[PDB]
Structure 1
Amino acid sequence: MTELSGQPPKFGGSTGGLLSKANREEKYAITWTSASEQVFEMPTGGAAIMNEGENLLYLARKEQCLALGTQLRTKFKPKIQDYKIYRVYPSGEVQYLHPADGVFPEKVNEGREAQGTKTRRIGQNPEPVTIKFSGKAPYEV
């Protein structure tokens, strides 16, 4: 969020990358360190080469960044788990996104507040007729 660093992956270009949304609306960044210069698959099509050391790459969506991240941590002989994903606005604001609290979300970490939790079963949702003409749905109450 200070200033993103890292070399761009060695890549000859493609038609599958950023469009107008990137400058008008929002784009996404993913950084990661690699112990070696090596080939990886671009989520936007084709092969690219990551540099030895730090790497910084811009993509159009959060999902493309997370797909690249899964590829990094599950498809290289020594894993790459230090990748960071940010949201970037045209104003220049950079919003750190992933991993949210410095710990991957699959494993418990202290300090997280439950969101969207219900203290009931799915079968214990109320009848819709009981909540009609309100703004809610049985899972929102």
Structure 2
Amino acid sequence: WTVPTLNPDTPSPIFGGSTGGLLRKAQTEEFYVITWEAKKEQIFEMPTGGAAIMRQGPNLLKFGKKEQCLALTTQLRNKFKLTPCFYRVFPDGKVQYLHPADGVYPEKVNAGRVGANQNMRRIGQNVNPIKVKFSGRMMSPAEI
């Protein structure tokens, strides 16, 4: 498996437009682009409000935050049994692949994933805040 590359010249689903789309953040900070493959033309619900028609083949959409892209991914996976993927696009043109990060969905275990933020103890074994006091900043006992 290899990381996919965003194709900016990808057809978008048939939508008449809405007022819940992108804002100035997309032009000044970042935005997100979701792409998927549809077996047939089908009407789905847009996470920003309204009903759009996904075309047969590739489909590309833009959203203001990652939650909208994942909500659309969940809707396409649970209802139409599709496999969507999204990226984070910056105004300079940089594209960053986001989900599924390793090509496999995170709900199923995949080899090569290194565990992060894992504490080899339980909650009851956490120390008291007095032992964490006078640190660099506000730190919780779970951070150590």
State the TM-score, normalized to the length of structure 1.
Answer: 0.94
Cα root mean square deviation, aligned: 1.0
Q: Which 4+ runs in 1 deviate beyond 3 A?
A: 1-5
Give, in whole Å, the separation in 2 of the partners of 1:52 and 1:130. Answer: 60
After TM superposition, the structure 1 stretch with the greater mean CA deviation from structure 2, 114-123 or 1-10, is 1-10
The counterpart of 1:80, out of the listed 65, 76, 82, is 82
- Distance (Å, rounded) in 2 between the aligned partners of 1:2 and 1:32: 11
Give the alignment's TM-score, normalised by structure 2: 0.92
Provide the rounded CA distance (Å) in 2 between the counterparts of 1:5 and 1:116: 38
Amino acid aligned to 1:62:
K
Gap runs ≥5 in structure 1? none
Candidates 18, 42, 58, aligned match of 1:54 = 58
For 1:1-141, list aligned pairs within 5 A.
Answer: 1=5, 3-76=7-80, 79-81=81-83, 83-135=84-136, 136-141=139-144
Runs of 5+ consecutive residues of structure 2 not aligned to the other structure: none
Distance 1:113 1:126 in 2: 26
Shift of 1:91: 0.2
Judging changes above 3 Å, is the alpha-carbon distance between structure 1 residues 57 and 2 closer, same or farther for their aligned structure 2 residues? closer
User: How many Å separate the matches in 2 of 1:122 and 1:5?
Assistant: 50
Q: Identity over aligned residues, as a percent?
A: 61
